[PDB]
């Protein structure tokens, strides 16, 4: 299940960067950006395979891709943020 809606302005600024890359269709800093997210644990709504895709949210100072990600769904404005490597998700509201 989804934890709630969070305004874009309330998330780290790198979340804004990723959504900009997603709109311009990259390019992305990681070759893994844009792969399918399987939703294997059923935290998000059930959808066909390939409905969700994962993009990194850069963690300042990390050597690794860290724990932040943006999950997009195929619907208009459906984008979820996770800060704990897919444990919890919040829907992103780009209007605030």
Any idea which residues carry the catalytic annotation? Answer: 54, 85
Is residue 25 a contact residue for ligand 3GP (CB under 6 A)?
no
Measured at the CA of 7, the angle between CA 4 and CA 12, to 5 degrees, comes to 105
Is residue 40 a contact residue for ligand 3GP (CB under 6 A)?
yes
Residue range at the interface with ligand 3GP (CB under 6 A); choices 4-12, 13-21, 34-42, 76-84: 34-42
Measured at the CA of 21, the angle between CA 16 and CA 41, to 5 degrees, comes to 75
Between CA 50 and CA 58 the distance in angstroms is: 23
Residue range at the interface with ligand 3GP (CB under 6 A); choices 7-15, 17-25, 38-46, 70-78: 38-46
Neighbours of 72 (CB within 10 A): 20
* Binding residues for ligand 3GP (CB under 6 A): 32, 35, 37-41, 54, 86
């Amino acid at each position: 299940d989804v934890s709630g809606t969070v305004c874009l302005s309330a998330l780290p600024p790198e979340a804004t960067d990723t959504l900009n890359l997603i709109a311009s269709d990259g390019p992305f800093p990681y070759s893994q950006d844009g792969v399918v997210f399987q939703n294997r644990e059923s935290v998000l709504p059930t959808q066909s395979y390939g409905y969700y895709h994962e993009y990194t949210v850069i963690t300042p100072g990390a050597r690794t891709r860290g724990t932040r990600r943006i999950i997009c769904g195929e619907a208009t404005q459906e984008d979820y943020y996770t800060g704990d490597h897919y444990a919890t998700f919040s829907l992103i509201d780009q209007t605030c």
